[PDB]
Amino acid sequence: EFTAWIARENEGAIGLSQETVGESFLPQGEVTIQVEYSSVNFKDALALTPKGGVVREYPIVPGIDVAGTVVESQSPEFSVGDTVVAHGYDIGTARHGGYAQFARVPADWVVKLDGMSTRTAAAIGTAGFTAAMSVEALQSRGVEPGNGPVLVTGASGGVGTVAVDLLSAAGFEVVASSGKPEKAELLTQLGASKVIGRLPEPDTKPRPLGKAQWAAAVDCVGGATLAHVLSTIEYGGAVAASGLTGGPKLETTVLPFILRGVSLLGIDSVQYPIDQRRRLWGRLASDLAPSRLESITHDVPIADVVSVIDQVRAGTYSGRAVVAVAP
Amino acid sequence: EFTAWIARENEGAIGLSQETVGESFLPQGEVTIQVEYSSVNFKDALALTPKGGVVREYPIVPGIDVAGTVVESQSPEFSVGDTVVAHGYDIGTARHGGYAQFARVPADWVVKLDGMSTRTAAAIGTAGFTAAMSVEALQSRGVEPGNGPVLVTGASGGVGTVAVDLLSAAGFEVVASSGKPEKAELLTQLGASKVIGRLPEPDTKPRPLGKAQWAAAVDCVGGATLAHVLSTIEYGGAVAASGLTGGPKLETTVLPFILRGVSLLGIDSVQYPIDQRRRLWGRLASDLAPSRLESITHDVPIADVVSVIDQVRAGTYSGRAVVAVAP
Numbered sequence: 001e002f003t004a005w006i007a008r009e010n011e012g013a014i015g016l017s018q019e020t021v022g023e024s025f026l027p028q029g030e031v032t033i034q035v036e037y038s039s040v041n042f043k044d045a046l047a048l049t050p051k052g053g054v055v056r057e058y059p060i061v062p063g064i065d066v067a068g069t070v071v072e073s074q075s076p077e078f079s080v081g082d083t084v085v086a087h088g089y090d091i092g093t094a095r096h097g098g099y100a101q102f103a104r105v106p107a108d109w110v111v112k113l114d115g116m117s118t119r120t121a122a123a124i125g126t127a128g129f130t131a132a133m134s135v136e137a138l139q140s141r142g143v144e145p146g147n148g149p150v151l152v153t154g155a156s157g158g159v160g161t162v163a164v165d166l167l168s169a170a171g172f173e174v175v176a177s178s179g180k181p182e183k184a185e186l187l188t189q190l191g192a193s194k195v196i197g198r199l200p201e202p203d204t205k206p207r208p209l210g211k212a213q214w215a216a217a218v219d220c221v222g223g224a225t226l227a228h229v230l231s232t233i234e235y236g237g238a239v240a241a242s243g244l245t246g247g248p249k250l251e252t253t254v255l256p257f258i259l260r261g262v263s264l265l266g267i268d269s270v271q272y273p274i275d276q277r278r279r280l281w282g283r284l285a286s287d288l289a290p291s292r293l294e295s296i297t298h299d300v301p302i303a304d305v306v307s308v309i310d311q312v313r314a315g316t317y318s319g320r321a322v323v324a325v326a327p
Numbered sequence: 328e329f330t331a332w333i334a335r336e337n338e339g340a341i342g343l344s345q346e347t348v349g350e351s352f353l354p355q356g357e358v359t360i361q362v363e364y365s366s367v368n369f370k371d372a373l374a375l376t377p378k379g380g381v382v383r384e385y386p387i388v389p390g391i392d393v394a395g396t397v398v399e400s401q402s403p404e405f406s407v408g409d410t411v412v413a414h415g416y417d418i419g420t421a422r423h424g425g426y427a428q429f430a431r432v433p434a435d436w437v438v439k440l441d442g443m444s445t446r447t448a449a450a451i452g453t454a455g456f457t458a459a460m461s462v463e464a465l466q467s468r469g470v471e472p473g474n475g476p477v478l479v480t481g482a483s484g485g486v487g488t489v490a491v492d493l494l495s496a497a498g499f500e501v502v503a504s505s506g507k508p509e510k511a512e513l514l515t516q517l518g519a520s521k522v523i524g525r526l527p528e529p530d531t532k533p534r535p536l537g538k539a540q541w542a543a544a545v546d547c548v549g550g551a552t553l554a555h556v557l558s559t560i561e562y563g564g565a566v567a568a569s570g571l572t573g574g575p576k577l578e579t580t581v582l583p584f585i586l587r588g589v590s591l592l593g594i595d596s597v598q599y600p601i602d603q604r605r606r607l608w609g610r611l612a613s614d615l616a617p618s619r620l621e622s623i624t625h626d627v628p629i630a631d632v633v634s635v636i637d638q639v640r641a642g643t644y645s646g647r648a649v650v651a652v653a654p
């Protein structure tokens with residue numbers, strides 16, 4: 001038996017509840033993990049919110065990111081003592097995740113760590129992984145430094161911040177767009193050449209093709225922002241669409257695509273194929289490592305997690321929270 | 328002096344006029360081509376249509392595709408006797424194009440033919456080139472035969488017919504969507520596994536995420552058709568958008584992108600960089616040669632062109648018209 005921090009719904013509200021629990025509580029899987037570290041994401045905070053729309057059904061241990069050490073394995077790909085990261089698929093949303101001393105997952109959902117420490121794996125986590133996919137996607141369509149600035153929208157969120165870091169470190173001129181002026185310095189510290197406010201700017205008349213400004217973009221916002229970005233991408237550029245704030249509707253035109261050769265590349269880390277996921281983590285370990293992430297990382301003891309979750313939900317938390325569970 | 332077929336605007340009508348002209352009438356450029364073949368596209372019909380929206384100003388020699396022999400060159404890259412194809416940029420829309428015995432173009436807009444004949448290069452033309460671009464775009468995002476059908480919308484048009492041919496020949500299972508049931512046989516002859524009508528079908532409810540039926544698509548329609556296609560692409564699939572039939576507006580959602588990892592890739596043959604254009608014509612000569620295009624190709628003497636333009640404008644023309652400018 002071990003300690004798990006279980007989310008439970010009673011009379012409409014949702015509460016994180018520290019409880020001792022046995023083996024039979026864990027979901028089904030070939031690989032059991034002593035969870036060293038986890039993270040706090042907006043998605044983890046939504047799992048502890050009434051109408052959050054993230055959890056299929058309670059009760060559930062939240063924590064979409066799981067990083068730690070294999071204690072038991074019924075799979076020949078993983079040995080005891082291997083360090084691993086597991087994220088995406090059902091983890092922390094439809095089955096028990098990282099906010100517990102132990103977790104169990106299929107081997108088909110597990111990534112083996114090499115150089116990278118478990119703490120770093122968790123610090124990067126789903127958010128940084130998604131940023132890395134966005135960078136690969138853009139590069140997969142010919143985007144290279146020195147044909148203009150790369151825009152990152154919703155830049156202060158978890159994906160945006162790592163994107164700025166990765167793109168700047170790969171030699172792109174990054175312009176970060178954020179609706180939170182208090183975050184401009186942090187974004188600059190992460191490599192933004194400039195920081196601007198929300199898009200479109202209030203005065204702007206929307207056109208099918210507006211003034212070409214951006215060589216590429218990483219979009220974390222969707223809606224009218226994305227529609228505006230598409231109208232202002234340069235000939236042959238691309239946009240990696242990673243996120244949604246507001247409704248899902250997108251009202252655009254086909255003109256940037258057919259007249260400007262623009263590409264819109266949808267980024268999904270949840271169901272990304274495991275072979276590719278493992279490959280990408282290797283990059284995260286090496287050439288795609290976020291160099292300046294540590295400088296905004298803060299260690300949060302699992303016991304103090306509700307405090308951070310609340311600030312993340314309120315949108316007032318600064319930096320990246322890596323949750324110390326069992327280290 | 329030589330013969331040109333010139334489109335002139337007269338009291339609201341647009342007619343093609345066979346006229347004797349001299350060198351000074353040719354536009355500026357390093358390469359002079361004795362035109363052997365051109366083609367009829369819907370775009371060329373529109374050039375010869377009152378509110379067609381394709382021609383910058385009249386008078387103009389229409390014909391977006393030019394294939395023939397270099398007879399003069401101020402450029403070291405082209406020699407007298409070289410066979411070439413020239414299409415895109417301003418050709419046949421903002422400067423004199425292929426419906427004339429000679430044409431002149433910058434060297435940077437010219438593709439030198441090796442194996443390929445000028446007849447073949449005209450028969451493929453812009454429409455076939457655009458089909459080949461669409462196939463490359465899909466493959467650039469991982470699309471492969473064997474894990475579901477590929478949709479081709481507006482399939483009976485110039486781009487769609489060549490896309491059916493190329494995709495079926497590469498092993499894909501191609502479903503051809505066509506609003507013209509009389510064309511089903513021709514589409515089957517070019518390799519369509521199945522032929523269906525227009526999309527969406529009247530009895531389908533439009534959703535953000537509809538039934539995942541298509542591994543990928545080549546869309547030549549845009550509008551509500553493209554919105555529907557985007558909502559019905561399977562996880563990780565892609566769409567190559569080349570066309571606009573209706574309005575340019577596109578009302579969609581970000582959900583196929585964000586939740587299903589779908590890509591939308593805009594296809595522009597008009598301004599595509601010459602270096603890439605030249606490489607892709609090498610492929611059309613070899614690994615991407617449309618194997619069944621000759622079976623639907625028809626030679627049309629330049630003198631009889633108006634008859635074919637009128638049928639193409641009406642949507643009543645069967646197959647591909649290659650125009651023999653020079654005897």
Ligand SMILES: [Cl-]
Binds near residue numbers: 155156179180
């Ligand atoms: Cl933001």
